[PDB]
Symmetry: C3
Amino acid sequence: MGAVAVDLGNRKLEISSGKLARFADGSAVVQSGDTAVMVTAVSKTKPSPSQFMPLVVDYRQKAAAAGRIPTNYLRREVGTSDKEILTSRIIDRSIRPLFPAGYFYDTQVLCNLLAVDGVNEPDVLAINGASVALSLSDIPWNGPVGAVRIGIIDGEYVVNPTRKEMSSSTLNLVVAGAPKSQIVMLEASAENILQQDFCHAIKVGVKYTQQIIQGIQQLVKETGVTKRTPQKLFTPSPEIVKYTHKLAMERLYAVFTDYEHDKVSRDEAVNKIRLDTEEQLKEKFPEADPYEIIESFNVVAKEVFRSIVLNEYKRCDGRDLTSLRNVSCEVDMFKTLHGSALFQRGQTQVLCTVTFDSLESGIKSDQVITAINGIKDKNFMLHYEFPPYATNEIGKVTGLNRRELGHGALAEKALYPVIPRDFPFTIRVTSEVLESNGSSSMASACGGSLALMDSGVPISSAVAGVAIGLVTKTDPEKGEIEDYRLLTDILGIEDYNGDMDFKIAGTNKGITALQADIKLPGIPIKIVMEAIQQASVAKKEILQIMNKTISKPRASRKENGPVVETVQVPLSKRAKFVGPGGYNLKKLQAETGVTISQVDEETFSVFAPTPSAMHEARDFITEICKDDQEQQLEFGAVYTATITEIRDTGVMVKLYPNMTAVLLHNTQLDQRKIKHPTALGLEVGQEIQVKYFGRDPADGRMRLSRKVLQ
Amino acid sequence: MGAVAVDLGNRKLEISSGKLARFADGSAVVQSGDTAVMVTAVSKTKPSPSQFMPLVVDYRQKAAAAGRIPTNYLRREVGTSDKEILTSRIIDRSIRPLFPAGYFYDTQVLCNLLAVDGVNEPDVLAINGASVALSLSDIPWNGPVGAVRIGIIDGEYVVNPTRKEMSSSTLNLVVAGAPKSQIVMLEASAENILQQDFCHAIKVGVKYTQQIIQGIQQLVKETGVTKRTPQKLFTPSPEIVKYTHKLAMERLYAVFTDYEHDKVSRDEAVNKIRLDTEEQLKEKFPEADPYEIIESFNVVAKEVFRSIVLNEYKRCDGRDLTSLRNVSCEVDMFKTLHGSALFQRGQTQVLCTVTFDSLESGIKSDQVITAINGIKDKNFMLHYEFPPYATNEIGKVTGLNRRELGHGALAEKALYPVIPRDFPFTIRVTSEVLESNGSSSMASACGGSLALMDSGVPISSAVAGVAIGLVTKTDPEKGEIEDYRLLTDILGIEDYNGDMDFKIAGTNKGITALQADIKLPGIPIKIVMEAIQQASVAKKEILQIMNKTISKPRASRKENGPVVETVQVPLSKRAKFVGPGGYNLKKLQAETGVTISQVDEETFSVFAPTPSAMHEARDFITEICKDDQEQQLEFGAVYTATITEIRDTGVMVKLYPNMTAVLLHNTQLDQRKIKHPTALGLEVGQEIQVKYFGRDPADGRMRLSRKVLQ
Amino acid sequence: HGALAEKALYPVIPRDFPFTIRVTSEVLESNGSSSMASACGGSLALMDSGVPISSAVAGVAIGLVTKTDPEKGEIEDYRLLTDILGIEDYNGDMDFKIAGTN
């Protein structure tokens, strides 16, 4: 019956074990205030067929996030919301690096919101619960880890703020740390604040995570556990690594020394060397798993790359530690687009499109779907696309692609603090990668800032983003970082063989978003501060380059900019205009794409993406309040039309069955309003001659006349 | 050309074949009254890659049963509604046991509703059509089977009733009889009916299914189809079985005879013996399929388990045939939940949560997708969750597992009869299994009964559910049943090795739900009656235990429970408050979770999950609709209002964030006719005495005016 | 196939009708030319249901068999097949689905 209480300033965290799902390898329950979340972790024993960590983590959304109840194709959830994906990705990036290397077994972690009071957020509870469950199970781990959230309100740091304080907070930061004050997960979003407060918040967060770790360590020592022994660790044998190094170090050094190489050429050369070395190894040791050979080669390559970076300060192209690739920016690519931006840094190249849309477009039909998806505070949201062909790869274009969603959320959080408070239309920023060479999220946010800058949306201090990489040479005994180097504007290979990824974006004088992905098992805060400083310098340079192209937003939107207007509809014609159940409007809404709403019984708001579409819709409205339905009728021309229907105010006459019946009205039948058209020889099935005269818009009648024939 | 008519009291079943879908292995058409359904069965001729019966049955649908057309994802019923899932599960549990053992070939059975009239339901017709198609095709079988549905109206057992009958019946039973009067599949839902009536209904149904069996036999004799011979049956060799038995019977008896074992330890010992036995077999017959070895070992284990059960009357852990494992119940686990219950029957443990919700939540956005499923006449519905960690397993959490959906439907039918007639809120009973050891469906039903018992829902006679297993020593010479034993509250292993499974739920006097799937090719009625008696005794005992911890539900639900309030919004500001196209309302809803409905042009209904949520919502509308949210009080009470902002001709005053900040005029505010109210001292926060004239359409809000005050 | 059948049947529908029209076709035995068969059967079904149409709609399939010369990639001899069977389609060179009126 493990149970412990941890005090954080004002909040109390109750961590409990047992009593709930004892069959799982690790079960934990974290309770804060009145809400509580239960986390389970289960790992198999048979080694996975795949040669890598098949770790999966899931965060099941529940009802009381706002007091609503979630309904989907599963009546609770199919797919996820953005929030679930973000929380799952946070938990993954927080717990994965602590796992021992070479551990290749299925491992699934679930977290369920047992009960939500709507006062305390459950995600920061979920991370701690996952840490407890892992540390308390037989699964090997190097944890435990402790996660806290820091907000800033009225110049004061608050640990684990409530939702009410969340709304008014100018900063929302999530810090997950390791024992001995090692940071493992940083995720922050602030409203363009200075870096000094950022450093202070980071220090406070790590200080509190130390207390959390103290408490959980006390619990695990109290209850006592015994980590299971994995049947096999998939680490490469030291002898194979030694032979691979002695066989390929010179060639790898040679191919990494020259600075005339794109991604493709360098990858091809290293792949050829890999083929030769793999053949040599298979000849030398025809008794080992081929994956072991591949892993040995990869380890040798990573070691060589890290060594050359550490000892020569030229990463792979002659760039120093603090530099960046060439940057090119283009705006206004196509007239028909509200805003176009093309941002190309080095090999990486992305395109961002800004398209306006009606406010009502941001709300779905049913309440439940809107609630689960939520509504952005500012009427603005950004979509991020990563098609496979951007990396010369073939893959399923559709689906979810959680990495795409995470990158989109990151970029949207980066761009958020500069969107103006209100706008007549919803901002729909769309960015997609075209040539992917790493740091695509920062480039996408940068290009989106450029596109918004072009579309005339009044913003301030166009945002710029940058990535930071870290290379460490550490002792094998204590794991202490003996030496470290920082890299600015990393490449794909730099990230792949690096130790951590640090994507940070901000304005000319503040930081907006931060998402530090670290693969090492924890790093000291000093490295983080150095990264922040270098990133600030790089951001200044990038902003200089951008402002060299475009600085102030355009005075007005493009002539193709959407227009919102009002239309007056009399009550008498109101029913005819709206149609049964508003069907006509829907049809019109689906015909030209304009959006029609009503403000009162008479005024109607009309939103149109293009002025031409607006004028067309206005003509359609004028027609609707007028008369219509004419087909193949001429003035003074005899038409051999066969009558089909009999009605008081006219006859539905068709020239032939393949023609919409037109109203031959009695009022134009001998110029006398009758309820019996047959008085003028209007007999169904008779090949009469019908002559058109005009129209009656207000009366809603046709001027068809058989009187000329009769 | 097969055509045969079968008479059931007053209904005619026309079975036809050879006219449509002649390409399929077996095609049948069943016509009752004017509803016709065609069923096709196709089986491959190659052994499946898997090593088990890969039966797949699908029951398509046309939504014309209510007259509408299915348009969930396409203009058909591609959405796989819950009713379709239940029907498919019924078909599977009705036809699977009749297949010969070891038949491992892909086999798919599809049902298409050729024509429905809303008078005769097609499901039972679908079962009969599947039976006919299988019996008439070359696929080996031991049928045919005959399915009927029995209803009770005014003490009369009607057979195959019409929809109006289903509406008026107190019982709905479905029987899948087999030749020589054997029951294969039983599925019944009654509105808390007695026991002997249930027995009589079972007898009538099994008597009636003989006629349809006779008809199908006549048809198949007329056509004279010849079954194909399978290329290879996958039953283990008898001699290998003999060797495995002689090798492992001692150890298996030793492990199964002790009474100190959870599920995990017993499974571990079984697997431990399995490894050595497999090694011995490999050393003995290094020429057989390894899966044959696995099957031989499993057969030996099942045989010895059944033998020990039959001969010693002690199943496991010292429990006799009738006694059931321990049960513990807890209520009110968390304050914020509307109702919480925790049930722990032996090793199985399930948590049940009940949360209220608005009636409008039970209706989807459009109409067509709403009609794909019912509306649950007694406003109530159950959600069932079977996460993989409940059984220490790994699996996808999303994808609509048919087993979990069927179990949830069974629990919902079990709990339906005791729900009160009407209730101001929809009831959502969520049950998630945590420790899974079999019979989790009845445990979930009991937990939901407890949760309702706790949330103050005025229900009667808390429902209890139990499971029953059967172990028989059949004679392969005649296929008869020589000795049988009935087990109460089976474990997972007992179900796995048992001949069948029975689930019975009911009140202190009656029976509500009854699902009985049998893995044997039919069983006599006597066994069913014995199972009914045993389940009745067990239900009495379980209710006796349950009532100790809770009874006579709480007079009122928890104060955190939802509240419903009336609101008055006169027209002039009704237009503003609703906003363009109601957008404002939606903007409120997803941002606070409150639900707003328009009672009429003047009144609105407000539904809030918590009183705190209601206060938050009214304050949000206070701060977001340019005015304040409004609450209904007695008209004609002099109050005092604080000033939010100062106007030249008036004020924007309000009393609390629960009545609209009302614009006042000089004739209403300033009796001194001064352009500056600040002369009187009117400032932000200053109280002014106002008269509550009530909500009037002239202003669009409550008429707050000081005609004689100040 | 559904879109092809729908476009085939489109020009024989009156400009207006009091109700939406849903033409659902299900295949039961496939031996090629299923789309034209579905369209023609839908023509019959609409014809029966009472909704007026300009005329009946008939669909057909055409196959082609060519003895090409690989040395030049030319068409030496060709033969046309009416109402192509499934095997002919599978081993043929092309498929032609065409529908119309009288």
